[PDB]
């Protein structure tokens, strides 16, 4: 009474083949579940991580390849551009032809790159300002440096867009690096070595003279600059409550409270806000409201920027644009950048060009690429089994608050309010098959010249930024998606109160109409509750049914949340990670995603038990002496099989907001009664510790 279905027979052979028979589930369930995935496999030289999740992404790229690279005489204008785009992106001979010339075409737009100019001060430095310089970067090229000023959905009013000012992202992976010793020594050496390599070609190309000692010199100053800017930046720990973060202001007080003297100006926020947004000649006066995320970062910069030349700063800011552009040029430039990605990512090669390239248009043209993937790739009724599945997991989420003892029932009950108010997204806008015009229409400012990859790169940039600036005074498009379809993840938004499940996940092992439902709830199921639960993690707990940051928690129900979730803080926090040299995870930077793992799994078990009840138990699959109940957990586990190169683990541990997969599993399993019951685990089995963290 085993099913012998091919689509049964198929799953069996995937499961056993990843599992190692010969470990105790209750001693290390990762090895249980993943032990023979590990044995057989080795990280590829272009990976920093590898594993099932990744291999799914790798298989998205083939299909994108199957579906970008062959002209179709009936393609509509919108398809035709991506493909142009794509074809343009894979023509190396052409990109090499052109050596460096394409930024040289640029430098002068961005007031140049001092360390590769003759007599900089006199070519640009008369003119240079802060506001335009920084503002040009932002506005054309939407690289944000020194002072990050953007437009986003407003956290108090989520029909409404507004302008934010924040600290800058940085050259290295996180502020920790700029310590620049021990396990960041290399990366640091390689980052300025890179500034160097690149400043050097640039000049070569200029037929200028190389003073390697003065390069060593300029480029190391630049480093000292970002170091100081790094130290001024706020930790992720203190950014992680959106009530302390959200401080709303007019350029007015802003101009008053956070003044800045750059070059000896001093700095004019109304200048530089206008010298950006008048890139759709939108109009900005000293009573503009403005959300400031990094009050202190700007308190802190005056003292810094005080001591730097106009030239000091543009070498940094210009070298932070030029960084990224570099892989859009000839081998000789790309080369520049080996040691710096081995130092960061551990890889000894780049990934296949068709790959990087598929991914670029997918990212730049998501809707249009969206379309092609679904036609190739994704089955469509799908959309309908999911929704119900989602139904299911919704209720169970409703089910459960009654049963949670740490809340009071005013709060229990609003929570309900977000509940049914969650809007779901599955697969893709029917839009994007249905409606050629809109499609052609959203790309219509686009035109791509197949011998012009840079030029398109550069278009596409100026696109999206102006696409973004466009937005100050418009209402949030209710209709818009946060994922391309094209993608193997799923999401939750606060603005939107929305859960998103791209066709890209809508596929094995998380879901097929056809495998057993055990693995469906094990899989997409736990994923649906992952997103919903983000609902209420330490971030989205502060957001109401409409996107809006407004406090709907009983005083004491708050203190209780913290009280419960503090437990996870401490659990995952004492996880130490060999691949990262034994370093401890960061249990705060991970609370959200840990919290929502644990919610979602249980959420989903319950959904599956219920399926028990009303549908009755289902035929077993060959090969495996386990029951469905455990298979549930099996699939959950196997989602996250794989491993990590050392360099990127260091990096991950400071820059990811997930836990690594092996602890997404053990932390969460360590916390699952349904678990250690399934697998009949002695008390204080390592997978079965008495203390068990719970919140949702």
Ligand X SMILES: *[C@@H]1O[C@H](CO)[C@@H](O)[C@H](O)[C@H]1NC(C)=O
Ligand Y SMILES: CCCCC[C@@H](S)C(=O)N[C@@H](Cc1ccccc1)C(=O)N[C@@H](C)C(=O)O
Would residue 154 be called left, alpha or beta, if left means φ above 0 and alpha means ψ between -120 and 50 degrees? beta
Closest distance between Zn ion and the C-beta of residue 52, in Å?
17
593 binds ligand Y (CB under 6 A): yes
List 308, 492, 577, 608, residue binding ligand Y (CB under 6 A) = 492
What is the DSSP-derived secondary structure letter of residue 576? B
Q: How far apart are CA 495 and CA 423, in angstroms?
A: 12
Peptide bond just before 664 cis, omega within 30 deg: no
Q: How far apart are CA 215 and CA 377, in angstroms?
A: 51
94 binds ligand X (CB under 6 A): yes
Q: Which stretch binds ligand X (CB under 6 A): 26-34, 219-227, 270-278, 349-357?
A: 270-278
Residue with tokens 């006066």: 285
Q: Which stretch binds ligand Y (CB under 6 A): 77-85, 148-156, 388-396, 488-496?
A: 488-496
Residues 7-66 that bind ligand Y (CB under 6 A): 53
Burial classification of residue 436, based on how many CB atoms lie within 10 Å of its CB (0-12 exposed, 13-18 middle, 19 or more buried): middle
Q: How many CA atoms lie within 13 A of 486 on its CB side?
A: 25
491 binds, among ligand Y, Zn ion, ligand X, none (CB under 5 to 8 A by kind): ligand Y
List 491, 561, 648, 663, residue binding ligand Y (CB under 6 A) = 491
Do 304 and 298 meet the contact criterion of CB atoms below 8 Å apart?
no
345 binds ligand Y (CB under 6 A): no
Residue with tokens 């924040």: 166
Active-site residue, 531 included: yes
* Mode of pairing for the β-strands spanning 491-493 and 498-502: antiparallel
Classify the C-alpha dihedral 450-453-454-460 as positive or negative.
positive
Closest distance between ligand Y and the C-beta of residue 422, in Å?
14
List 6, 93, 119, 281, residue binding ligand X (CB under 6 A) = 93
Residues 382-421 that bind ligand X (CB under 6 A): none
**Between 88 and 542, whose beta carbon lies closer to ligand X?**
88
Active-site residue, 597 included: yes
Residues 646-685 that bind ligand Y (CB under 6 A): 658
Tallying the residues shown for the chain, one arrives at: 696
**Between 218 and 593, whose beta carbon lies closer to ligand Y?**
593
**Between 225 and 528, whose beta carbon lies closer to ligand Y?**
528
Closest distance between ligand X and the C-beta of residue 130, in Å?
8
Which of 88, 136, 209 has its CA nearest to residue 454?
A: 88
Q: Which stretch binds ligand Y (CB under 6 A): 151-159, 463-471, 486-494, 614-622?
A: 486-494
Residue with tokens 């992720």: 236
Establish whether 534 is an annotated binding residue: yes
Do 17 and 509 meet the contact criterion of CB atoms below 8 Å apart?
no
Do 155 and 289 meet the contact criterion of CB atoms below 8 Å apart?
no
Residues 113-172 that bind ligand X (CB under 6 A): 129, 131
Q: How far apart are CA 673 and CA 685, in angstroms?
A: 12
The values of phi and psi at residue 348, to 5°, are -110, -5
Establish whether 593 is an annotated binding residue: yes
Closest distance between ligand Y and the C-beta of residue 658, in Å?
5
274 binds, among Zn ion, ligand X, ligand Y, none (CB under 5 to 8 A by kind): ligand X
Q: How far apart are CA 606 and CA 628, in angstroms?
A: 14
What is the DSSP-derived secondary structure letter of residue 351? P
Q: How far apart are CA 412 and CA 400, in angstroms?
A: 10
Closest distance between ligand X and the C-beta of residue 344, in Å?
26
Do 361 and 89 meet the contact criterion of CB atoms below 8 Å apart?
yes
Closest distance between ligand X and the C-beta of residue 342, in Å?
30
Q: How far apart are CA 508 and CA 515, in angstroms?
A: 9
Nearest position to Zn ion, beta carbon: 593
445 binds ligand X (CB under 6 A): no
- Those residues whose C-beta lies under 8 Å from the C-beta of residue 590, and which sit 6 or more positions away, are 572, 656, 657, 658, 659
Tokens standing for residue 428: 């893709």
Establish whether 584 is an annotated binding residue: no
Residues 453-482 that bind ligand Y (CB under 6 A): none
- Those residues whose C-beta lies under 8 Å from the C-beta of residue 268, and which sit 6 or more positions away, are 131, 255
Active site residue: 61, 218, 597, 647, which one?
597
Residues 240-259 that bind ligand X (CB under 6 A): none
Establish whether 384 is an annotated binding residue: no
Q: How far apart are CA 444 and CA 436, in angstroms?
A: 12
Which of 665, 407, 636 has its CA nearest to residue 536?
A: 407
Q: Which residues sit at the interface with Zn ion, rule CB under 5 A?
A: 593
Closest distance between ligand X and the C-beta of residue 576, in Å?
9
637 binds ligand Y (CB under 6 A): no
164 binds ligand Y (CB under 6 A): no
**Between 286 and 440, whose beta carbon lies closer to ligand X?**
286
Closest distance between ligand Y and the C-beta of residue 491, in Å?
5
268 binds ligand X (CB under 6 A): yes
Nearest position to ligand X, beta carbon: 574
List 238, 451, 474, 563, residue binding ligand X (CB under 6 A) = 451
Q: How far is CA 253 from CA 130, 250, 256, 261, 471, in A?
A: 20, 6, 5, 16, 24
Closest distance between ligand Y and the C-beta of residue 151, in Å?
20
341 binds ligand Y (CB under 6 A): no
Q: Which stretch binds ligand Y (CB under 6 A): 259-267, 375-383, 432-440, 487-495?
A: 487-495
Closest distance between ligand Y and the C-beta of residue 639, in Å?
6
Q: What is the largest CA-CA distance in the chain?
A: 84
Tokens standing for residue 197: 């390599």
449 binds ligand X (CB under 6 A): no
**Between 119 and 574, whose beta carbon lies closer to ligand X?**
574
53 binds, among Zn ion, ligand Y, ligand X, none (CB under 5 to 8 A by kind): ligand Y
Q: How far is CA 557 from CA 77, 321, 561, in A?
A: 55, 46, 6
Do 47 and 355 meet the contact criterion of CB atoms below 8 Å apart?
no
Residues 571-610 that bind ligand X (CB under 6 A): 573-574, 584
Closest distance between ligand Y and the C-beta of residue 489, in Å?
5
Tokens standing for residue 345: 């990512």
534 binds ligand Y (CB under 6 A): yes
Q: How far apart are CA 139 and CA 123, in angstroms?
A: 22
490 binds, among ligand Y, Zn ion, ligand X, none (CB under 5 to 8 A by kind): ligand Y
573 binds, among ligand X, Zn ion, ligand Y, none (CB under 5 to 8 A by kind): ligand X
266 binds ligand X (CB under 6 A): no
268 binds, among Zn ion, ligand X, ligand Y, none (CB under 5 to 8 A by kind): ligand X
Active site residue: 531, 537, 538, 647, which one?
531
527 binds ligand Y (CB under 6 A): yes
Write b or e for each residue in 438-458: b if 16 or more Cβ atoms lie within 10 A of its Cβ, otherwise e.
ebbebbeebebeeebbbbbbb
CA–centroid distance for 201 within its chain:
32
Do 522 and 631 meet the contact criterion of CB atoms below 8 Å apart?
yes
Question: Which residues of the shown chain bind ligand X in the complex (CB under 6 A)?
Answer: 87, 91, 93-94, 129, 131, 268, 271, 274-275, 278, 451, 570, 573-574, 584
Annotated binding site: 49, 530, 534, 593
Annotated binding site for a peptide: 49
Question: Which residues of the shown chain bind ligand Y in the complex (CB under 6 A)?
Answer: 53, 489-492, 527, 530, 534, 593, 639, 658
Annotated binding site for Zn(2+): 530, 534, 593
Q: Among all residues, which ones are annotated catalytic?
A: 531, 597
């Amino acid at each position: 009474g085993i099913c012998k279905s091919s689509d049964c027979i198929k799953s069996a052979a995937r499961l056993i083949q990843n599992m190692d028979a010969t470990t105790e589930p209750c001693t290390d369930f990762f090895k249980y579940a993943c032990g023979g995935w590990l044995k057989r496999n080795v990280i590829p030289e272009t990976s920093s991580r590898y594993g099932n999740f990744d291999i799914l992404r790798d298989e998205l790229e083939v299909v994108l390849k199957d579906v970008l690279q062959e002209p179709k005489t009936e393609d509509i204008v919108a398809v035709q551009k991506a493909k142009a785009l794509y074809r343009s992106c894979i023509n190396e001979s052409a990109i090499d032809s052109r050596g460096g010339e394409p930024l040289l075409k640029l430098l002068p737009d961005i007031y140049g790159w001092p360390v590769a100019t003759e007599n900089w001060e006199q070519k640009y430095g008369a003119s240079w300002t802060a506001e335009k310089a920084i503002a040009q970067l932002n506005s054309k090229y939407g690289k944000k440096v020194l002072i990050n000023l953007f437009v986003g959905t407003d956290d108090k009013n989520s029909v409404n867009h507004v302008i934010h000012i924040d600290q800058p992202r940085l050259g290295l992976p996180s502020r920790d690096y700029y310590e620049c010793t021990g396990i960041y020594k290399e990366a640091c050496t390689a980052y300025v070595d890179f500034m160097i390599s690149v400043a050097r070609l640039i000049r070569q190309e200029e037929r200028l003279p190389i003073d390697e000692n003065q390069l060593a010199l300029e480029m190391n100053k630049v480093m000292e600059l970002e170091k100081e800017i790094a130290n001024a930046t706020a930790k992720p720990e203190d950014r992680n409550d959106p009530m302390l973060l959200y401080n709303k202001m007019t350029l007015a007080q802003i101009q008053n409270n956070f003044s800045l003297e750059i070059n000896g100006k001093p700095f004019s926020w109304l200048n530089f806000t206008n010298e950006i947004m008048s890139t759709v000649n939108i109009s900005i006066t000293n009573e503009e409201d403005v959300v400031v995320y990094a009050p202190e970062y700007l308190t802190k910069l005056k003292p810094i920027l005080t001591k730097y030349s106009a030239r000091d700063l543009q070498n940094l800011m210009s070298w932070r644009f030029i960084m990224d552009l570099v892989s859009s040029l000839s081998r000789t430039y790309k080369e520049s950048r080996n040691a710096f990605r081995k130092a960061l990512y551990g890889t000894t090669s780049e990934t296949a060009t068709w790959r990087r390239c598929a991914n670029y248009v997918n990212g730049n043209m998501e809707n249009a690429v969206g379309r092609l993937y679904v036609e190739a790739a994704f089955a469509g009724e799908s959309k309908h089994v999911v929704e119900d599945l989602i139904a299911q997991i919704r209720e169970v989420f409703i089910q459960t608050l009654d049963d949670l003892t740490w809340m009071d029932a005013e709060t229990k009950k609003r929570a309900e309010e977000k509940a049914l108010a969650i809007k779901e997204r599955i697969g893709y806008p029917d839009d994007i098959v249905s409606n050629d015009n809109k499609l052609n229409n959203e790309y219509l400012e686009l035109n791509y010249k197949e011998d012009e990859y840079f030029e398109n790169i550069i278009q596409n940039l100026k696109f999206s930024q102006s696409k973004q600036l466009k937005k100050l005074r418009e209402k949030v498009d209710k209709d818009e998606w946060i994922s391309g379809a094209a993608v193997v993840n799923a999401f939750y938004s606060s603005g939107r109160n929305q859960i998103v499940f791209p066709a890209g996940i809508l596929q094995p092992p998380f879901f097929s109409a056809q495998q057993s439902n055990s693995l469906n709830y094990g899989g997409i199921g736990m994923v649906i509750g992952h997103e919903i639960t983000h609902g209420f993690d330490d971030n989205g707990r502060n957001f109401n049914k409409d996107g809006d940051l407004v406090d709907w928690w009983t005083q004491q129900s708050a203190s209780n949340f913290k009280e419960q979730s503090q437990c996870m803080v401490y659990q995952y926090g004492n996880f130490s990670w060999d691949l990262a040299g034994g370093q401890h995870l960061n249990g705060i930077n991970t609370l959200g995603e840990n919290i929502a793992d644990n919610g979602g799994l249980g959420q989903a078990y319950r959904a599956y038990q219920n399926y028990i009840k009303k549908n009755g138990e289902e035929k077993l699959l060959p090969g495996l002496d386990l029951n469905h109940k455990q298979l549930f957990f099996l699939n959950f586990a196997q989602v996250w099989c794989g491993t990590y190169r050392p360099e990127y683990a260091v990096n991950s541990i400071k820059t990811d907001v997930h836990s690594p997969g092996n602890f997404r599993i053990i932390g969460t399993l360590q916390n699952s009664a349904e678990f250690s019951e399934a697998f009949h685990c002695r008390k204080n089995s390592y997978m079965n510790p008495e203390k068990k963290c719970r919140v949702w």
